[PDB]
From a paper:
Therefore, oligoribonucleases (ORN), RNases targeted toward short oligonucleotides, are needed for the complete digestion of short oligonucleotides into mononucleotides. Among these, ORN belongs to the DEDD superfamily, comprising 3′-5′ exonucleases that require a divalent cation for activity. Our research group have focused on the mechanism of action of oligoribonuclease (CpsORN) from the psychrophilic gram-negative bacterium Colwellia psychrerythraea strain 34H, to understand how the enzyme hydrolyses small nucleic acids. Structural analysis results show that CpsORN is a stable dimer and its active site is formed by swapping residues from the other subunit.
Author numbering:
A (entry chain A), B (entry chain A): 2 to 181
């Protein structure tokens, strides 16, 4: 329930990877408890974007985010970045108290960068720490390389599945890589 | 030796934590192999700083970095940021090839932020991933909370010890938290 040591998982899609001139296009939040049971599903926002930014997005993402259906959802969305922030932060505020959960996902150091610039209010609620599953992957690769084979290969259309299968991935690290 | 899957550990001290107006004051690099045996000790640089920045550093760090001896070493250093970059990057280039090792340390997402802005050439050599021991700490705290008690309490005058005791810390996660 909404107390104790629950976790905020999130994933993001951007234009490219340099945040001082690149922008958030999508965000999703998933809250689990400490044992990786999904406890809640936050809002999924496609953030309004200038038609100019979206057409001259850095390519391949042009290819990928046109392919996703995501790009037009930003053309057709009136969700500012503020509103996304305001309701993202409200969402989390009812599942764990300020400053207790880390930011959990895959390669999450790079998401914070954009979170810290564009969604300052949303970041103030997270523990200063990250919990990156991709950090564990590579201890795995260097120590017990065989457990990597029980990770499921792919599939991640929406950001939710990107979150969900990074939660699944941890659970096979939990049972096959950690003492108890 | 200088091949295979060796690791670049580093730690940093800054003025404060907002990089677009805060600056690197110190850097150290330690290379280990994949089993946490220290393989090499890189240069330790105290980066030249304007007397203006250093006096109006964000306080407490004023207290701490005056206390450290670090602050005057920056006043007395002619090491630009470029030189630090140039020889940091040369150092690493002889222990692991470009794009293979992650950036390893404690709460390292926040160091990259400064690395990516101020030392771009040094970052191009790291795997895009971080390996953060502080990520493991909190899986520990949430799953087998008892193993935290074999972590050694503190002591970290220089950046080296900050690196070294984050390498020590992993080794007690290795033996008491991970299957094998
Ligand atoms: Mg992602
Ligand atoms: Mg540090």
């Amino acid at each position: 329930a909404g107390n104790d040591s629950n976790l905020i998982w999130l994933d993001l899609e951007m234009t490219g990877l340099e945040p001082v001139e690149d922008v958030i296009l999508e965000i999703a939040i998933i809250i689990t408890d400490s044992e990786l049971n999904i406890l809640a599903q936050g809002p999924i926002f496609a953030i309004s974007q200038t038609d100019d930014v979206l057409d001259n997005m850095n390519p391949w993402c042009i290819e990928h985010h046109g392919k996703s259906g995501l790009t037009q959802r930003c053309r057709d969305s009136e969700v500012s970045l503020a509103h996304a922030t305001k309701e993202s932060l409200a969402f989390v505020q009812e599942w764990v108290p300020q400053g207790k959960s880390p930011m959990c996902g895959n390669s999450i150091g790079q998401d914070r960068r954009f979170i810290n610039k564009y969604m300052p209010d949303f970041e103030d609620h997270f523990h200063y720490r990250n919990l990156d599953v991709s950090t564990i992957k590579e201890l795995a690769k260097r120590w017990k390389p065989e457990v990597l084979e029980s990770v499921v290969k792919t599939g991640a259309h929406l950001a939710l599945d990107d979150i969900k299968e990074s939660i699944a991935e941890l659970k096979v690290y939990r049972e096959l890589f950690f003492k108890l």
